[PDB]
Amino acid sequence: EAPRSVDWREKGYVTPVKNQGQCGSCWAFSATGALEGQMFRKTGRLISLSEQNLVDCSGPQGNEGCNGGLMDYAFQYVQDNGGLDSEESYPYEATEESCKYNPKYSVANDTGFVDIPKQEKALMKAVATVGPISVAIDAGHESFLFYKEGIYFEPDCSSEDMDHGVLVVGYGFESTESDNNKYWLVKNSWGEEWGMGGYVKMAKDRRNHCGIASAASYPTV
């Protein structure tokens, strides 16, 4: 099913690549990424959202600030809290601070979230139909830290111990690559100097490589 290629960046759904710095907040960038996309779907307005808001404020939902967290917990915080502040209003500091949420600066909401079935087919359908999707991958590899170009494939990757929250913004195939030629287009949060301007093409339809389909979800708006 679905189109053979999808890239939500071409439609105005995606903010530029951000940089989490020396703070374990990948989950918060994945979540703001998915929420940015869904708010844009809903309203036609793209507004960068505050990861710091999530880092400082979503402890009650289970998140652990710069020590780690879950995208679904972030989506839950937005729902419980009744809002989330803009990036511009509540800027990213890459450390933990007092929660400074101000509803006057809220620019987004959600009514909960949807967990996608653990299959690449379902992830494809979600990406094609919904917009950018929050996912977690096994990025615990020198090959990933030093990734620069090409479709990422790591023979020692696992689908069971994912450690890194990122955002799938589309998928395609490389006229070049063909044998195992499909990729997921993944927005990372490590700045533009990493990978391909901050993005990585992850191997697609190679039996759920790196667990990309195992922890996929999106916020309901």
Ligand X SMILES: *CC(=O)[C@H](Cc1ccc(OC(C)(C)C)cc1)NC(=O)[C@H](Cc1ccccc1)NC(=O)OCc1ccccc1
- Residue placing its CB nearer to ligand X in the complex, 139 or 169: 139
- Please identify which residue in 14, 34, 78, 162 interacts with ligand X, judged by CB under 6 A: 162
Provide the pairing of β-strand 199-203 with 151-152. parallel
Q: Does 68 bind ligand X (CB under 6 A)?
A: yes
The answer to whether 160 and 133 have CB atoms below 8 angstroms apart is: no
Shortest Cβ 112–ligand X spacing (Å): 17
Q: Does 139 bind ligand X (CB under 6 A)?
A: yes
Q: Does 202 bind ligand X (CB under 6 A)?
A: no
DSSP structure class, residue 10: G
Task: Give the distance between the most distant pair of CA atoms in the chain.
Answer: 52
Contact window for ligand X (CB under 6 A) among 44-52, 69-77, 80-88, 198-206:
69-77
The answer to whether 168 and 203 have CB atoms below 8 angstroms apart is: no
Shortest Cβ 27–ligand X spacing (Å): 4
- Please identify which residue in 69, 170, 195, 219 interacts with ligand X, judged by CB under 6 A: 69
Count of residues in contact with ligand X, rule CB under 6 A: 19
Q: Is 67 among the residues known to form the active site?
A: no
- Residue placing its CB nearer to ligand X in the complex, 40 or 194: 194
Q: Which of 197, 180, 178, 198 is nearest to 189 (CA)?
A: 198
Q: Which of 33, 220, 216 is nearest to 115 (CA)?
A: 216
The single residue of 53, 157, 188, 209 carrying the catalytic annotation is: 188
Q: Does 124 bind ligand X (CB under 6 A)?
A: no
- Cα gap 159→164, rounded to integer Å: 12
The single residue of 53, 157, 164, 210 carrying the catalytic annotation is: 164
- Please identify which residue in 6, 8, 18, 27 interacts with ligand X, judged by CB under 6 A: 27
CA separation, residue 93 to residues 16, 33, 123, 216 (Å): 17, 18, 32, 27
Q: Is 188 among the residues known to form the active site?
A: yes
Residue 34 in tokens = 């998915």
- Residue placing its CB nearer to ligand X in the complex, 24 or 150: 24
Q: How many CB atoms lie within 10 A of CB 103?
A: 10
The answer to whether 52 and 11 have CB atoms below 8 angstroms apart is: no
The answer to whether 209 and 153 have CB atoms below 8 angstroms apart is: yes
Binding site as annotated, residues for Zn(2+)? 10, 51, 72, 87, 93, 97, 115, 138, 141, 161, 163
Binding site as annotated, residues? 10, 51, 72, 87, 93, 97, 115, 138, 141, 161, 163
> Known catalytic residues?
26, 164, 188
